Amino acid sequence: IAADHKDLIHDVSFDFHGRRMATCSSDQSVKVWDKSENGNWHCTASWKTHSGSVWRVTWAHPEFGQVLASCSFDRTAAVWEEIVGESHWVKRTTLVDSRTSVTDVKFAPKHMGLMLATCSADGVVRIYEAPDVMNLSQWSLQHEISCKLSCSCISWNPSSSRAHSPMIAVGSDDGKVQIYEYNENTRKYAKAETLMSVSDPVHDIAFAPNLGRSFHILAVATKDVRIFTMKPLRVTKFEIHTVAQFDNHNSQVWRVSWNITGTVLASSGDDGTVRLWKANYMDNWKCIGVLKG
Amino acid sequence: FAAKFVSHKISRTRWRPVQPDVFATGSWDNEENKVCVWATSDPKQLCDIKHPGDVMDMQFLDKERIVTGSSTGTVTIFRHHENNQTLSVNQRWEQAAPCTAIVCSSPEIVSVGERINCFRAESRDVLRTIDDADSHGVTFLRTTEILTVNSVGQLKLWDLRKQGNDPTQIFSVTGERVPLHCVDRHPNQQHVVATGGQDGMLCIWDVRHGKMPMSLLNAHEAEMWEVHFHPSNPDHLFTCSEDGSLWHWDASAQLEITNLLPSSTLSVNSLDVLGLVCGTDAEAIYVTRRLF
């Protein structure tokens, strides 16, 4: 069913269950879809979130509640809570702090708490926390760090904490890759390492779920697909390897996405082809198959 | 014990009003929720009910009629015209939140939630509504008394006969450990009652003889599932557990409880046995039709 967006759709996101979908567009509206038990996606609600185009959206962990965060060229991020009784979603808060148009917003892993990051044309990554879970309006600004200027994407490590430490990859412009970690009790983000050999503009980056694997994997959709393997070992405690590169798109790779398990990677591009990837026994990636449109 | 793969995780089973030969069944958890009447005994899918809405309540509303309660706390009933193989959907109510069990007091199909909406015999208007929030035990101790048992396993005799919205009495364990899954009320006398402990215990009850916890146990493994009892031998009964398990506690025998059923499968659907199932806490697919 047609998204019902007048202007172009920037982002689509699934909830935790995978039953709900959120969309955002340049028409300034966010639509939420319900996958009915009868299998047709029907939109639950659509509302005018922002004054300017809405680039990005994300869903928080379902333990906190039904929360969607949005990101706009109006320089704001908004948090919304679903009201069962309904106008369906209410603004919890606004983040005015970004002095420029924001490219992306992502919730952190559930173990961390309500935490989110955002990156903007100001090139300042900001992290906001809700220090009280009860007060969904109480969003404090946890941290601010400087990057460079142009493109942007964010992607947290989804690794459950207790097992692993928090870290986040930021991909702006490029072939240049920037990576950041969290310090012990400095409570500040440090630049552990960088992803090298980035090619063209990094349209997208995602960290893969590290379920049952010691090492971590991040894939970038530049105008080439790359996969990087991070391993901490033990001052410094980081290493990267580059697992694979893939140009069979022959063009811009706009989206890179991972499976829930991290088993499958997907890539899409200007060929209009979507490729699914599996890891070999050798840890090389292979294309399982290609969808077209 | 002739098993049969429905290839459909069963949620309901009735030895129908018409021995335990006319089987009917309601299959929840499918993309268009399912139920079949006259199935199977032999294919006999005369009324494999194409149906939106799932099965919360379920009753053979006649030998040619079928009552049921639908997934959102909706209501659903047709008249099983087994001659011409079609039917007519009798009852369709919207918002009676699902219902948690099913009781009867003929022919006001009383029930409980996990609020009470007393529909009745041709009472297409919701007549009585003692809208008391419940924090799954439901029966007719005497017409039209009942006892709501909240998920603290917290029984409380109320009514719909006289006016009022409180309960009249309350049955309770010392610790309220388990939740409202499976209680018992004897056909030997409608003032005799028990329950099954979700640890694998009994919880036998005395109405007149005080209100004490008469008989616990420690026999089964999982949550209290449901009990096959003979529909005429009140005493004959056998026990179960929430993997779908079944320990034959020969209670017309004296503790004679063994590894009873064709075991080790997933869960069982819902109980009616006369001359059959004793459905578990998780309602998967299983069958055997040799109940004598």
């Binding site: 601010e144 012990e184 400095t186 409570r187 500040k188 | -």
Partner: protein, 61 residues
């Protein structure tokens, strides 16, 4: 170092004053403490504030 900060964090020089430098006595710099009423009012001044922040980063007084 959180425990050390707490030991440092517990002591207070005087009320009422924004003694981050009290923390500096601690020797631990916190961005939160650094977080600009004049900057907020400004909403050239911003550039000057940025220059001041850079100089501070490059002294504490």
């Amino acid at each position: 170092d959180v425990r050390s900060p707490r030991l440092f964090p517990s002591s207070h020089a005087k009320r009422t004053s924004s003694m981050g430098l009290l923390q500096s006595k601690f020797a631990s710099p916190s961005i939160s403490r650094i977080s600009t009423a004049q900057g907020s009012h400004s909403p050239i001044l911003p550039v000057t504030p940025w220059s001041v922040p850079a100089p501070l980063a490059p002294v504490i007084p």
